[PDB]
């Protein structure tokens, strides 16, 4: 970024999911003239985030590679995968952290 910053002054760095703002001038030796965000001025709620800390049997779940081949965690994962598939009208996406984690867990739910 040094050729960029020392070649151009009118440089705008912005995004939608940058947080915290100061960490990027922390990791990269540059400074900016002003650092603030924007709140969501929403009339009504339109996005509903949930934190699933426990399965249907009140059993917690995690993506740790050591406990990756845990059949109970598999049972929970397939459980709410099925439930959200049944209640999902149009389109749903799943995001595992790693492809091998996929390949294992999809092959054994295929089992």
């Amino acid at each position: 970024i040094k050729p960029v910053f020392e070649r151009f002054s009118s440089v705008i760095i912005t995004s939608g999911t940058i947080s915290p703002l100061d960490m990027y001038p922390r990791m990269l030796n540059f400074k900016t003239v002003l650092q603030k965000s924007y709140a969501m001025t929403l009339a009504k709620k339109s996005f509903l985030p949930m934190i699933i800390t426990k399965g249907s049997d009140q059993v917690a779940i995690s993506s740790r590679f050591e406990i990756r081949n845990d059949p109970s965690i598999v049972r929970n994962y397939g459980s709410m995968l099925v439930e959200f598939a049944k209640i999902t009208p149009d389109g749903m996406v799943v995001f595992f952290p790693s492809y091998l984690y996929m390949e294992s867990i999809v092959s054994m739910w295929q089992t």
Partner: protein
């Protein structure tokens, strides 16, 4: 009486029962509470405000006599007020809240009763220092009066382990009760056990209430917790052990229960199978770790008739270990005389009692006050039934009309054989055969209960499906159990007093009783709890089915009424069925012909 109360002409059979002398407050619409000062009873509305806040308070300070859907009959007792002040509560606050939420003026006798039922909370305590029951009280004021008592013979002194139960009964009698709240965080004399609440365990709200009522101070309050069947008492005990983090011993009254709670414990807590050493005649191993657990049933400590030297070594090891926590699961049998050696043997600090039923034939259930303590928590049975924590049952009591074929011999039979003679009625066989047909037509797993092995095997043989009783060996009974569970050849089974309690068989949503005990209510209540823990207790449109085939023209109607009256008072009614369904629509009936009836009559005459 806040009145003159001139006796009314209609108050004659109201022997101090006409409760209209009270000046009813105009806030009777809002307030949900009456007081019955004649017997100490409490009448509570289920359709007026403040009842949700007052329900836990009334459970804490009072006992319910009857709770149907409309009016709850409660009763303040000194036992419940002691439980209240043991949780942490006081007479003046109780009186203030009672007048705050009471439609009626507070009775003088009730005020005096709550004033009397205030204990010296914190004055009398006991601790264990190196398997040493040290009576550590806060003052020598306690020491003066206790040494003034003739039984006994900051500052701590010794009382022998068998003398601990007697002096606890005595101090309860002189109303100087001891609280046993272990400072397991402060005490490090006992070996701390690195067991953690795994995130895989999350706790029900009433179970959290049960914990926090005995974890209000952070110490483990010692006592009883009564929860219904399948509520998660194992989870409550696991949570208590994980938040105590000390050496813990739990004893339950079955080796099958040993075997199931050991796997439950190693499942839902972070204690290791190395730390857990299981003690029975299968194996008597010990764990050599500084902290951990040894499980056995009550038999391998009570028995001295036929004991091995390895059993002697194990019970010596558990004698040597100063535990920090003890739970007596199914606490209804430990106050029996060969079983109440728990304080005399095991050095354990916190004493918790988990069971389903807090009733028995005699008054040994109140001995748990000076054995383990009072009831720290109870869950409301119909509240959990509507919450889905326990099941909803459409119980159908079958009044089988008595056959004269068997009655003619039953009337002239001697008393020891009249029972087996009227259990075995051919009409009852016919009704049971169609009921099994009808519920396999509905597709329900059926479990049949008989008090007699010969009747159980005769019913089982007439079905063509096997039997399980108390004399059946463990290997054969588990083979039959797995055949019933998985094999479709074994559609129904024939259980007994090994199936009435202390098992985990919730698949059978249909239950038919062909026989039971003479008057033991607890066996019938546990048989009801066998299906109260059923898995489909949450789905819409569910009603479990309970059946009791009882012969007419006997004392068995009164016997069944006695056995069922606790469940009726709980809210589990017993509906009247005499004329059954599908009578003759079934083609082929067990011992239908009168020749067949006389055949079975002389077959049972071979024994009777």
């Amino acid at each position: 009486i806040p009145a003159d109360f001139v006796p009314d002409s209609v108050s004659g059979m109201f022997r101090s029962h006409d409760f209209s002398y009270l000046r009813l407050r105009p806030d009777h619409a809002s307030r949900p509470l009456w007081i019955s000062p004649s017997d100490g009873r409490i009448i509570l509305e289920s359709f007026s405000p403040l009842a949700e806040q007052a329900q836990d308070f009334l459970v804490t300070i009072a006992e319910p006599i009857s709770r149907p859907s409309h009016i709850h009959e409660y009763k303040i007792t000194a036992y419940s007020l002691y439980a209240a002040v043991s949780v942490g509560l006081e007479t003046d606050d109780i009186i203030s809240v009672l007048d705050r939420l009471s439609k009626v003026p507070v009775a003088e006798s009730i005020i005096n009763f709550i004033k009397g039922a205030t204990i010296s909370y914190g004055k009398v305590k006991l601790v264990i220092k190196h398997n040493r029951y040290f009576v550590e009280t806060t003052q020598a004021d306690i020491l003066q009066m206790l040494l003034n008592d003739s039984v006994i013979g900051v500052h701590s002194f010794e009382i022998a382990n068998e003398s601990v139960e007697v002096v606890k009964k005595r101090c309860q009698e002189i109303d100087y009760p001891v609280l046993e709240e272990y400072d397991f965080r402060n005490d490090h004399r006992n070996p701390d056990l690195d067991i953690d609440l795994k995130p895989s365990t999350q706790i029900r709200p009433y179970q959290e209430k049960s914990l926090s009522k005995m974890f209000g101070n952070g110490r483990a309050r010692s006592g009883i917790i009564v929860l219904p069947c399948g509520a998660g008492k194992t989870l409550v005990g696991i949570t208590a052990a994980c938040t105590i983090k000390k050496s813990v011993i739990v004893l339950c009254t079955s080796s099958v229960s040993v075997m199931q709670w050991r796997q439950q414990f190693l499942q839902w807590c972070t204690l290791q199978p190395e730390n857990c050493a299981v003690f029975t005649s299968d194996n008597k191993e010990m764990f050599q770790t500084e902290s951990g657990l040894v499980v056995s049933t009550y038999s391998m400590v009570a028995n001295t008739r036929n004991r091995s030297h390895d059993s002697q070594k194990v019970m010596d090891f558990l004698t040597g270990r100063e535990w920090g926590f003890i739970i007596l699961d199914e606490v209804h049998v430990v106050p029996a005389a060969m079983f109440r050696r728990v304080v005399s043997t095991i050095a354990a600090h916190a004493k918790l009692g988990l069971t389903a039923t807090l009733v028995r034939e005699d008054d040994k259930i109140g001995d748990l006050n000076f054995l383990i303590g009072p009831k720290l928590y109870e869950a409301n049975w119909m509240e959990l039934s509507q919450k889905g924590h326990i099941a909803n049952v459409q119980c159908a009591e079958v009044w089988c009309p008595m056959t004269a074929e068997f009655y003619q011999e039953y009337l002239r039979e001697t008393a020891r054989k009249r029972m087996l003679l009227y259990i075995m009625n051919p009409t009852k066989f016919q009704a049971c055969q169609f009921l099994i047909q009808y519920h396999e037509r509905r597709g329900d797993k059926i479990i049949v209960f008989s008090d007699n092995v010969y009747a159980l095997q005769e019913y089982a043989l007439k079905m063509g499906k096997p039997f399980i009783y108390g004399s059946t060996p463990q290997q054969e009974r588990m083979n039959i159990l797995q055949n019933f569970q998985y094999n479709d050849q074994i559609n129904t089974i024939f259980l007994s007093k090994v199936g009435d309690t202390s098992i985990d068989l919730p698949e059978a949503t249909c239950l038919i009783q062909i026989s039971s005990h003479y008057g033991s209510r607890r066996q019938e209540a546990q048989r009801l709890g066998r299906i109260l823990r059923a898995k489909r207790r949450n789905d819409e449109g569910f009603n479990a089915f309970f059946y009791s085939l009882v012969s007419k023209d006997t004392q068995e109607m009164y016997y069944s009424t006695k056995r069922q009256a606790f469940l009726v008072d709980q809210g589990y009614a017993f509906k009247v069925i005499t004329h059954l369904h599908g009578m003759e629509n079934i083609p082929n009936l067990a011992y239908a012909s009168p020749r067949e009836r006389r055949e079975l009559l002389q077959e049972v005459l071979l024994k009777n």
